[PDB]
């Protein structure tokens, strides 16, 4: 594919006329990669107009798929394009990337067939430190800083030392501090993926929030409420809202079949419910402790040979639909052991 270097960015709140692709229906996140393939000659014609212009095309955030109604949308840039003449007809492959959020003013459809939209660029307001407006001239040098529990305790007391001057305390501003908030998302991100925050996760607060917006299952409505955000602090807060509202535990392959819930999560191990658990070969799997779990079949027999939990036999528990290795069904051998039967599902299969 033919690569591009140029980066185009329109002015804030300035009204711009940008065409909308009809094939694109899904809501776009700023900076998100989109693999498109357009067959229609008039659709390939719009792309041919963009490359010579500025490669910036509009993607509507459709509130209702029926009436095609969309109050918001995101601008997408064509960084790569390829024109392959396959079996006789002209086909184009377009790689899109989000640039700026926008408010839809008016939807006007041309006599040619394609549709255009009156676009107003949403201001990406980036607020700095909350302490910046109240920090004393003497404590200014203490702001720079050279076991994870100890760090955050010292981080709060030092950066937010001027909290006594305001009506609100130290810990209150932590709920609004980007660095503190980013760590809360990182915590639950580790509860699903083994990837370290050093390389897989970005450092910039605005960019980091946008990546999360896609992974976590968010229906159009949540995605719109997620885009109405024009500031980093409003984005991470909303990501925490999703983490504290949709606890629905499913299978990573099924995505629809329910395994268990947050209510059934019980603390047996002293680390909590889930910690690192290695079987005979050398696999590091984080095993969840739950009372009851639905949609799980029992294959073979429960063997007591190398059991993580003390004196429990592990039956090979699998899903009823995809047949993925979800975890185990630990049963008590002795009559004086409780919980008698509880599920030992690994993180890798848990959603």
């Amino acid at each position: 594919m033919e690569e591009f270097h140029g980066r185009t960015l329109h002015d804030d709140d300035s009204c711009q006329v940008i065409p909308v692709l009809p094939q694109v229906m899904m809501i776009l996140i700023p900076g998100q990669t989109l693999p498109l393939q357009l067959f229609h000659p008039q659709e390939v014609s719009m792309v041919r107009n963009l490359i010579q212009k500025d490669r910036t095309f509009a993607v509507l955030a459709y509130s209702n798929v029926q009436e095609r109604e969309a109050q918001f949308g995101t601008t997408a840039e064509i960084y790569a394009y390829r024109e392959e003449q396959d079996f006789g007809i002209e086909i184009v492959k377009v790689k899109a990337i989000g640039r700026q959020r926008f408010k839809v003013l008016e939807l006007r459809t041309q006599s040619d067939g394609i549709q255009q939209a009156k676009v107003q660029i949403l201001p990406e307001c980036v607020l700095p430190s909350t302490m910046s407006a109240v920090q004393l001239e003497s404590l200014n040098k203490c702001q720079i800083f050279p076991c994870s529990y100890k760090w955050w305790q010292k981080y709060q007391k030092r950066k937010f030392h001027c909290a006594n001057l305001t009506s609100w305390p130290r810990w209150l501003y932590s709920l609004y501090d980007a660095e503190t908030l980013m760590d809360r998302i990182k915590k639950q991100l580790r509860e699903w993926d083994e990837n370290l925050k050093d390389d897989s996760l970005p450092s910039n607060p605005i960019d980091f929030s946008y990546r999360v917006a896609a992974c976590l299952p968010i229906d159009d409505v949540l995605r719109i409420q997620l885009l109405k955000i024009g500031s980093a602090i409003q984005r991470l807060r909303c990501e925490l809202d999703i983490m504290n509202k949709c606890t629905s535990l499913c299978c990573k392959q099924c995505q629809e079949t329910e395994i268990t819930t947050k209510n059934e999560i019980f603390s047996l191990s002293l680390c909590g419910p889930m910690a690192a658990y290695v079987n005979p070969h050398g696999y590091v799997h984080e095993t969840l402790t739950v009372y009851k779990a639905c949609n799980l079949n029992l294959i073979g027999r429960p063997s007591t040979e190398h059991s993580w939990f003390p004196g429990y036999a592990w039956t090979v528990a699998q899903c009823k639909i995809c047949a993925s290795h979800i975890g185990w069904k630990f049963t008590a051998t002795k009559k004086d052991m409780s919980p008698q039967k509880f599920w030992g599902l690994t993180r890798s299969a848990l959603l």
């Binding site: 607020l127 040098k141 720079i144 050279p146």
Partner: protein, 789 residues
């Protein structure tokens, strides 16, 4: 559309800067005191201090330094505001008329560049040739000190080190050199760079990068014959000159990190030190070359922001949180040890976290009670018109909230004290505070190192004698937020409702909170109703005999039953986290820290809350108040005030649910709380009365006005700017305009009382120059606007 008047009733008292030199005369020693926007001039005397001239400036003072270049007999003062305005001033006195003049004026703000963590560092070369200002990370501004440089030309030189902790100018050098400590992935190093005016580029210094302490924060310039710079961190006081390096680690400075420093001797032998715990230390230099550095404790003073040495052991403590003290030091006389003696105590109201207008003795004239100071400097202040009399009540603990009960005749004050962790397993107070010094103590019902632990207490203080009668100690890991004193339901007794929240180091969001109820009768405090809720209780308000409490984001209302218990009625969920609550009649105001205003009204027919109008704009919010049914006063980021008006006569649903931002004004002060009423005795051309307390101690009043009064005052403002000379030649239209790091907007729907009232102070020809389209007819109108405060 809004039309409002904002006048400074009380000037800010918190000292931000204090330097000693020769401003008025070359022979007379002068002390300059900076109080946020106000400037004070004093002549150093053996008895104390003498006042000569006090001038108001149109900018938040951040940089203030005295220097003497060649040709000039007396020292010139350099002032840099928060609005980035460089100005050089000199004292002028002929017969009786005093007029401070500006030799050079100009702006030093750049269109590109992010503000640094340390902010602005103001340092001027000892030989008085150049001014060094670190405004942004990695960028260094150099402004020359010449007679030709009147417009103040500035150039930014690219520096390799982004994160700079503290920068100062070196002594005993031909070319100007800057010494600084930077942070990098390796640790912390001290580096020097030589400045050249010709090349306009940085060059190699007198010595290479040397390794220092991991917590090295302060850098002090050392004059001749010693030379070099002293670097003090948290544990030790290091010395550098090149090949020469001296290190001493005192255990007495380990208790609290030194934040401020001052030079005593003209050669560099004695140095005043001030930590976070208000302790006063002395840095002694032994002797061309240094023999050894000695650190000695003097005593206990106010939490110093900046120290200054005057004459004959008289030291002026510049405190932002506590009272400014003129303390005497006993360094001399080997017979008796080092002891500090306070001589004069300057009243400091800053900071103000909670305030109330309560009639105590007058029953007509409003008397304001403020929760001033922090930590050991935390004290109660009673303000009334005399001139304004201030009555101080020490607490020795951080005050949070205040409430009044006319039935029990006492004040309910929230307090937070610091208690260090014990080796065996417990806590012990640093010094006896109002809570431990109380007549009677009480504890709540329980459920289920070397670290400072914050413990909360509910204080009961008298309204005439001001004595700590009762103190209610709060549970472990519990933080108090809201406290209201009002009658609930059909109950005739007046209760104190507490909106506590459980804070844990591991729990970022508070998942636990209590709604404790207290009654005060026969000089005894008692627990009435305990209501545990899943979340934090930030703010509470009374709604027609019912208690409204906010749990995280949700807004809840409680009914007061005959069983003396709190009962849930209806829950109103919200997208944003509820933090600010204000009410009048039926209208309820909701606000967060991200400046997302939301108006709700309790519909009693359906038995719930209906969303009326909402305004979403991202900014750091701090304080809010309802002016009327449509107008509401709010305080946001970068020391500004805003007013948003709704329209009940809007033809479209989208218009009436939208709030129009009609109010824009830069106060130059940070407001944390708002309360109704007036300090004066109760035919006013001003509508309503809203008083406010700030971080620096500046107390003012916000009041609505009519359409005619606004235009009459607005046109007076543009004329007064022409006659009144601005201190530093900085525009009033630029200073009062809405300021933010991303945008600048003009002031609308606001009238500055500071410029209107100045018409009485200025002379008669300047009075006649404004009224000319009447001179004495306008005076009576200005005099009407002075009576209100």
């Amino acid at each position: 559309m809004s039309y409002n008047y904002v006048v400074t009733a009380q000037k800010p008292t918190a000292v931000n800067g204090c330097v000693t030199g020769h401003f008025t005369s070359a022979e007379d020693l002068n002390l300059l005191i900076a109080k946020n926007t106000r400037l004070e001039i004093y002549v150093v005397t053996a008895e104390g201090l003498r006042p000569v001239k006090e001038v108001g400036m149109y900018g938040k003072i951040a940089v203030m330094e005295l220097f003497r270049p060649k040709g000039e007999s007396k020292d010139l003062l350099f002032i840099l505001t928060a609005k980035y305005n460089a100005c050089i001033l000199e004292y002028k006195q002929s017969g009786e008329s005093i007029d401070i003049i500006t030799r050079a004026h100009g702006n030093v703000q750049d269109r590109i560049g992010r503000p640094s963590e340390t902010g602005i560092i103001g340092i001027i070369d000892p030989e008085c040739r150049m001014i060094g200002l670190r405004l942004y990370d990695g960028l260094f501004k150099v402004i020359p000190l010449d007679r030709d440089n009147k417009e103040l030309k500035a150039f930014n030189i690219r520096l390799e080190e982004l994160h700079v902790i503290d920068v100062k100018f070196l002594y005993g050098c031909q070319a100007p050199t800057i010494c600084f400590v930077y942070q990098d992935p390796q640790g912390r190093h001290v580096k020097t760079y030589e400045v050249s005016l010709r090349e306009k580029e940085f060059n190699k210094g007198p010595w290479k990068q040397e390794n220092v302490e991991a917590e090295a924060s302060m850098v002090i310039a050392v004059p001749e014959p010693f030379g070099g710079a002293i670097i003090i961190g948290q544990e030790s006081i290091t010395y550098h000159n090149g090949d020469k390096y001296l290190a001493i680690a005192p255990p007495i400075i380990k208790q609290s990190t030194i934040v401020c420093h001052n030079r005593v001797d003209p050669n560099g032998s004695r140095y005043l030190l001030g930590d976070m715990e208000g302790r006063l230390f002395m840095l002694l230099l032994e002797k061309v070359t240094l023999k050894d550095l000695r650190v000695e404790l003097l005593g206990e003073t106010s939490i110093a922001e900046c120290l200054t040495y005057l004459d004959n052991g008289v030291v002026f403590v510049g405190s932002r949180l506590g009272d400014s003290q003129l303390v005497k030091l006993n360094v001399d006389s080997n017979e008796q040890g080092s002891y500090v003696v306070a001589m004069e105590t300057f009243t400091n109201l800053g900071p103000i976290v909670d305030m109330c207008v309560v009639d105590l003795e007058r029953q007509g004239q409003g008397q304001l009670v403020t929760c001033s100071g922090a930590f050991k400097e935390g004290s109660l202040r009673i303000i009334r018109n005399g001139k304004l009399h201030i009555r101080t009540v020490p607490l020795y603990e951080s005050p949070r909230k205040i409430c009044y009960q006319e039935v029990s005749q006492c004040f309910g004050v929230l307090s937070s004290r610091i208690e260090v962790q014990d080796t065996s397993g417990g806590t012990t107070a640093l010094r006896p505070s109002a809570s431990t010094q109380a007549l009677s103590s009480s504890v709540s019902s329980s459920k289920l190192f070397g670290e400072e632990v914050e413990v909360h207490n509910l204080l009961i203080i008298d309204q005439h004698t001001f004595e700590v009668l009762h103190a209610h100690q709060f549970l472990q890991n519990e933080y108090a937020l809201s406290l209201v004193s009002c009658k609930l339901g059909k109950d005739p007794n007046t209760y104190f409702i507490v909106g506590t929240a459980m804070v844990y180091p591991e729990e970022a969001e508070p998942k636990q909170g209590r709604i404790v109820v207290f009654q005060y009768s026969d000089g005894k405090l008692q627990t009435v109703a305990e209501k545990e809720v899943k979340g934090a209780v930030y703010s509470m308000v009374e709604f027609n005999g019912k208690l409204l409490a906010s749990i995280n984001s949700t807004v809840r209302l409680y009914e007061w039953t005959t069983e003396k218990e709190l009962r849930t009625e209806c829950n109103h969920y919200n997208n944003i986290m509820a933090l600010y609550l204000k009410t009048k009649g039926d209208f309820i105001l909701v606000g967060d820290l991200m400046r997302s205003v939301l108006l709700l009204a309790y519909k009693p027919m359906e038995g719930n809350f209906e969303e009326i109008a909402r305004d979403f704009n991202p900014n750091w919010m701090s304080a809010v108040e309802i002016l009327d049914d449509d107008n509401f006063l709010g305080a946001e980021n970068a020391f500004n005030l805003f007013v948003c008006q709704k329209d009940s006569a809007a033809t479209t649903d989208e218009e009436r649910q939208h709030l129009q931002e009609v109010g824009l004004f830069h106060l130059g002060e940070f407001v944390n709380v708002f309360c109704h009423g007036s300090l004066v005795m109760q035919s006013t051309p001003t509508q309503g009365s809203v008083l406010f307390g700030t971080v620096n101690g500046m107390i003012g009043l916000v009041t609505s006005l009519s359409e005619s009064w606004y235009n009459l005052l607005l046109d007076m403002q543009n004329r007064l700017n022409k006659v009144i000379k601005s201190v530093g030649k900085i525009e009033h239209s630029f200073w009062r305009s809405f300021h933010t790091e991303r945008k600048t907007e003009p002031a609308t729907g606001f009238i500055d009382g500071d410029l209107i009232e100045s018409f009485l102070d200025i002379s008669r020809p300047k009075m006649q120059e404004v009224v000319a389209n009447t001179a004495d007819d306008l005076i009576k109108v200005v005099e009407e606007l002075t009576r209100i405060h």
